[PDB]
Design a protein around this ligand. Structure first.
Ligand SMILES: *[C@@H]1O[C@H](CO)[C@@H](O[C@@H]2O[C@H](CO)[C@@H](O)[C@H](O)[C@H]2NC(C)=O)[C@H](O)[C@H]1NC(C)=O
Ligand SMILES: *[C@@H]1O[C@H](CO)[C@@H](O[C@@H]2O[C@H](CO)[C@@H](O)[C@H](O)[C@H]2NC(C)=O)[C@H](O)[C@H]1NC(C)=O
Ligand SMILES: *[C@@H]1O[C@H](CO)[C@@H](O[C@@H]2O[C@H](CO)[C@@H](O)[C@H](O)[C@H]2NC(C)=O)[C@H](O)[C@H]1NC(C)=O
Ligand SMILES: *[C@@H]1O[C@H](CO)[C@@H](O[C@@H]2O[C@H](CO)[C@@H](O)[C@H](O)[C@H]2NC(C)=O)[C@H](O)[C@H]1NC(C)=O
Ligand SMILES: *[C@@H]1O[C@H](CO)[C@@H](O[C@@H]2O[C@H](CO)[C@@H](O)[C@H](O)[C@H]2NC(C)=O)[C@H](O)[C@H]1NC(C)=O
Ligand SMILES: *[C@@H]1O[C@H](CO)[C@@H](O[C@@H]2O[C@H](CO)[C@@H](O)[C@H](O)[C@H]2NC(C)=O)[C@H](O)[C@H]1NC(C)=O
Ligand SMILES: *[C@@H]1O[C@H](CO)[C@@H](O[C@@H]2O[C@H](CO)[C@@H](O)[C@H](O)[C@H]2NC(C)=O)[C@H](O)[C@H]1NC(C)=O
Lengths: 72, 711, 126, 67
């Protein structure tokens, strides 16, 4: 979105790889100058937690996301 | 038939047209020779008579469709007289268009720029602004004149030019043309000739093709000039970037002639100046004119009409007599060939005499053609004739045989490089300018460039084709192109491009007949009947034949080739390559004189608003510039205790994107040159950042002021 | 006789009272010329939006077209909007009130104020 | 305002309007424009003038320039 300065909201989960493909068609050189982390969700699910990490890191972080975080 | 009746009609028309034309021409000659209100009325009435006469004959020609006409001569004359023109437009349309044309011309002629220092002192372009753009070496002063001319007059032309475009297209479309651009490309159009036919679209292709072959030479010239200008304007020019438009030696950068003082290859070496020899040998205007006559007769061109010598302003009246003084050849008609000019004892005037007399020779040659077929093959033929005359006459060889330059002197290659660079500054320097301007106009007329992108593409094309960058970003409130005379005065421009090519093609061909052995840059066609013969072959043709055929008459080709132009500057080219060995030959269309202090700003309404996210329009932008100005004022009045009245106009925005990202920089309240340094602007933002965020219901995250960050 | 109160522009003049202490209270900013400049700019913005949307007309209203008068230490003043380059053309109070109502929120945001603190006398918040 | 090329001086044009014109708008234009241009330029000069004038008068044994 920043590399091609495209309108905010044009790229979604659906139009992303195709978007950057057409984007590379316009800017082939620049496309190679843009880092892109890999998103899998299953890889995220298949990431083992450290000992005691699940309770004092995983759950603690999820609760921060939860409302009235101090209650939970 | 029909052809028979058409021919009969044209015959009668020509008889009356030539006589009435003569009366109009004679009247204009009289008024030019003596500027009097009585003479004003004389020329006006005579002109009105001829115009009305021509209009009536135009309708009569329409009664003779050229389709049934087989004879080319009658067909050509019919087609010329037939042309309806703007008459095709409705009364209201015609009247409005005429008013726009007059308003635009008046704004250009009467528009004034007042010194910011003293509002009482205001300069016009013609005298004051032009002097600054041609002499001033103050970056700030040049920048002021350049921007002020576009900010004051350019805006006044923007709306008029828009309407002009619309009406012009309508008229041409109604005259059976794709657009007004196509209407203008009709000059070079040839039909119903075996191999000599030429399409209006062909012109575009040919111009572009030829332009690609000159690019290399121009790139070297550009790189050389950039290097020199870097010394003249230090900390102002990037050695890899484009050239600031306000430093090109004139208001528009049409010619680079005024950059010679800063680009002279060999300062120690002067250039031939036989004006002193002229005055020393008492060279009066009549003497210099005779030398011109001698030259033409030497190449085998008919002797100047005794009448010419009798009736011709060859020198300033000097007495109470008031007469205009622009070198001009006159074909008054009925064998009347006069020259009007305030001639002086100067090398320039000597060469101007040759140029003017060149036109007379062309006139005399085609004077025996049908009244309507008495003109240069195309719009770039006549001027080229004049140019090659001055070329041959300027050669030190010519002057040394004209008895002005002691032949004992030896022409120095350094002085040759000197001469070649000076010529390149005028010839090669205008080629990209001319090309780009016509390209822009063509695309605008055909709609390729929309109104919202007129200024956008203008500056994109400038940075890419001409390699020239705007010192200040100009939005679609500007009309930079319209700030030039031709654009604001509805004149074609491709003539200049084509003429330049034709000129060099002619010169080479004629010199080949002259049997030149040395560098073409030092060729004298004087004393060559063969060169004169080829020249005459085209000269006598007039408009009777296709310009493609007239070309074959001299050069032997049917299209404009740039090879001879390159051949002429080949010595310079080789030299430039050496000087540009260390330098970067080319430019990057990214460097700008204002990019350094420009702050990039990305805006995320939907990120911070989602629903009820207002659309960022010009009003939102206006608000932003106002908010920035507010910040600047606060910062200065607080940190500097300085009450500086920053306005939204001082906030210069550029590179606006649908991401709502743009680059902006702040200038002094009334000083385009004074750009507030990014440091101060960053501090000002930091100080009022919250306030700005509040104004747009945004936050540091959404209102990304790239370079400014919370802590 | 004559009334030193009557004014040729008073009819279309809109009174505005700003209550910084009522809203911001502690950490309230000081109203200066720059604050007044922002106000006129904000009004110009509002006028542009109103004409561009409701009237579908592009009128380049600037802070200069916003004519402020009777400025007081309670930050009260009468302002009237005028045509971009026509002093004689004063925008009717009705039209200006409509523009104010349309952009009231944004104006309040600009000064970090509220309809209660930012009182456009005659323009009634709903 | 319509044509920026057409500019009037006080005596040649502005005075004729203020003396002859009966148009509210035209009279308002000339009146405000005269004070919105020349008047704004004189403001700073007059401020210094008043200072130097007061100085000279007081130096010549006077309460103020008006005295
Ligand atoms: C110039 O004007 C003449 C006259 O209006 C045009 O000739 C007309 O053409 C149309 C279309 O073929 C006919 O319907 C009319 O009857 C013609 N009129 C006459 C008097 O012959 C002519 O086409 C115009 N030329 C251009 C290039 O627009
Ligand atoms: C086509 O028309 C032109 C014009 O009438 C003809 O040119 C004439 O040629 C005769 C014979 O040489 C001359 O006496 C005339 O003076 C010429 N007229 C002009 C105006 O130049 C031409 O010959 C015609 N062509 C044909 C094939 O009939
Ligand atoms: C071309 O012809 C002219 C005319 O004959 C030559 O002009 C002569 O120039 C020399 C040098 O200045 C003079 O000494 C002669 O008196 C000139 N002659 C005349 C008749 O004017 C000219 O030199 C010739 N050019 C070349 C290159 O041969
Ligand atoms: C004009 O010609 C002279 C002679 O060829 C050039 O001087 C030469 O320059 C080169 C490069 O610096 C040296 O290698 C030679 O030794 C020089 N020769 C002499 C005799 O000094 C001169 O540079 C040329 N000028 C131009 C404008 O090209
Ligand atoms: C407008 O701004 C320019 C740029 O700051 C000023 O030009 C400066 O002039 C001073 C005095 O001659 C020089 O020392 C600077 O180097 C100049 N700066 C540049 C970038 O050229 C110009 O003087 C200002 N004009 C006014 C009226 O204040
Ligand atoms: C500037 O604004 C004034 C006020 O609206 C205009 O003057 C009015 O013009 C109309 C049309 O002629 C009249 O009906 C009104 O009576 C006028 N009002 C006054 C107060 O005299 C004026 O025409 C506008 N000027 C321009 C250039 O648009
Ligand atoms: C004008 O100048 C003269 C000369 O300086 C002043 O006369 C002097 O006044 C002072 C104060 O009383 C005396 O100390 C001097 O001795 C006087 N000088 C002479 C030459 O007599 C005079 O007062 C000044 N006038 C004004 C209005 O300032």
């Amino acid at each position: 979105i920043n590399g091609f300065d495209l309108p905010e909201g044009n790229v979604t989960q659906e139009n992303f790889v195709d978007m950057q493909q057409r984007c590379n068609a316009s800017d082939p050189a620049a496309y190679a100058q843009l880092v892109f982390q890999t998103c899998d969700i299953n890889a995220f699910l298949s990431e083992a937690v450290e000992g005691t990490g699940l309770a004092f890191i995983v759950f603690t972080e999820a609760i921060t996301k939860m409302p009235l975080s101090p209650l939970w | 038939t029909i052809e028979e009746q058409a021919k009969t009609f044209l015959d009668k028309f020509n008889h009356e047209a030539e006589d009435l034309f003569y009366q109009s021409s004679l009247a204009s000659w009289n008024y030019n020779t003596n500027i009097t209100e009585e003479n004003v009325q004389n020329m006006n009435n005579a002109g009105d008579k001829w115009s009305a006469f021509l209009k009536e004959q135009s309708t009569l020609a329409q009664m003779y469709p050229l389709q049934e006409i087989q004879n080319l001569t009658v067909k050509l004359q019919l087609q010329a007289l037939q042309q309806n023109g703007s008459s095709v437009l409705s009364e209201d349309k015609s009247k409005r268009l005429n008013t726009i044309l007059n308003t635009m011309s008046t704004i250009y002629s009467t528009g004034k720029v007042c010194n910011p220092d003293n509002p009482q002192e205001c300069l016009l372009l013609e005298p004051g602004l032009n002097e600054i753009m041609a002499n001033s070496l103050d970056y700030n002063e040049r920048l002021w004149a350049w921007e002020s001319w576009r900010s004051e007059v350019g805006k006044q032309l923007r709306p008029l030019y828009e309407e002009y475009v619309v009406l012009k297209n309508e008229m041409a479309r109604a005259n059976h043309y794709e657009d007004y651009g196509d209407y203008w490309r009709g000059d070079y159009e040839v039909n119903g000739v075996d191999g000599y036919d030429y399409s209006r679209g062909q012109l575009i292709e040919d111009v572009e093709h030829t332009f690609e072959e000159i690019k290399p030479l121009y790139e070297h010239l550009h790189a050389y000039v950039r290097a020199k200008l870097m010394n003249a304007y230090p900390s102002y020019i990037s050695p890899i970037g484009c050239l600031p438009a306000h430093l090109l030696g004139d208001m528009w950068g049409r010619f680079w002639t005024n950059l010679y003082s800063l680009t002279v290859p060999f300062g120690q070496k002067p250039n031939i100046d036989v004006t002193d020899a002229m005055v020393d040998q008492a060279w009066d205007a009549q003497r210099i004119f005779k030398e011109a006559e001698k030259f033409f007769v030497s190449v085998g061109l008919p002797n100047m009409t005794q009448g010419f010598w009798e009736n011709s302003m060859l020198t300033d009246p000097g007495n109470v007599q008031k007469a205009v003084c622009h070198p001009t050849a006159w074909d008054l008609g009925k064998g009347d060939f006069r020259i009007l000019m305030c001639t002086k004892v100067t090398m320039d005037d000597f060469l101007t005499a040759h140029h003017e007399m060149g036109h007379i020779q062309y006139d005399m040659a085609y004077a025996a053609q049908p009244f309507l077929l008495r003109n240069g093959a195309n719009e770039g033929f006549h001027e080229a004739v004049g140019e090659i005359m001055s070329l041959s006459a300027a050669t030190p060889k010519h002057l040394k045989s004209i008895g002005l330059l002691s032949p004992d002197f030896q022409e120095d290659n350094e002085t040759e490089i000197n001469f070649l660079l000076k010529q390149a500054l005028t010839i090669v320097g205008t080629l990209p300018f001319t090309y780009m301007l016509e390209k822009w106009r063509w695309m605008v007329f055909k709609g390729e460039i929309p109104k919202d992108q007129w200024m956008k593409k203008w500056w994109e094309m400038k940075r890419e084709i001409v390699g020239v960058v705007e010192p200040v970003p100009h939005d679609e409130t500007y009309c930079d192109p319209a700030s030039l005379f031709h654009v604001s005065n509805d004149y074609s421009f491709i003539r200049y491009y084509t003429r330049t090519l034709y000129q060099f093609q002619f010169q080479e061909a004629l010199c080949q007949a002259a049997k030149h052995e040395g560098p073409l840059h030092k060729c004298d066609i004087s004393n060559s009947t063969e060169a004169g013969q080829k020249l005459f072959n085209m000269l006598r043709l007039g408009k009777s034949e296709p310009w493609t055929l007239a070309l074959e008459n001299v050069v032997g080709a049917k299209n404009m080739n740039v090879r001879p132009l390159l051949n002429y500057f080949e010595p310079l080219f080789t030299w430039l390559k050496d000087q540009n060995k260390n330098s970067f030959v080319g430019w990057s269309t990214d460097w700008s004189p204002y990019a350094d202090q420009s702050i990039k700003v990305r805006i995320s309404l939907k990120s911070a608003l989602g629903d009820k996210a207002y659309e960022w329009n010009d009003n939102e932008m206006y608000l932003f510039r106002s908010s920035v100005a507010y910040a600047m004022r606060q910062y200065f009045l607080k940190v500097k205790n300085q009450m500086i009245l920053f306005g939204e106009e001082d906030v210069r925005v550029a590179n606006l994107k649908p991401r709502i990202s743009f680059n902006f920089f702040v200038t002094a309240p009334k000083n385009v040159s004074d750009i507030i340094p990014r440091t101060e602007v960053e501090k000002a933002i930091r100080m009022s950042r919250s306030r700005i965020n509040d104004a747009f219901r945004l936050n540091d995250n959404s209102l990304e002021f790239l370079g400014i960050q919370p802590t």
